[PDB]
């Protein structure tokens, strides 16, 4: 229960649609109400999974 309470006390994530990927772990994403962005990926996700 304490492990359940600490993980919920954390800022939420953003949802954004990927247009298409760049090279070397970079993509091209407009969020919802902003310009587009070139960001970095995490460990568990890959370029070929996009």
């Amino acid at each position: 229960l304490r492990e359940e309470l600490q993980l919920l006390q954390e800022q939420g994530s953003y949802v954004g649609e990927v247009v298409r990927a760049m090279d070397k772990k970079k993509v091209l994403v407009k969020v919802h109400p902003e310009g587009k962005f070139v960001v970095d990926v995490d460990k568990n996700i890959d370029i070929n999974d996009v």
Partner: peptide
Amino acid sequence: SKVDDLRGTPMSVG
């Protein structure tokens, strides 16, 4: 390599 660190990691579009 410093250039890739010179630019920001959340690269934006203008």
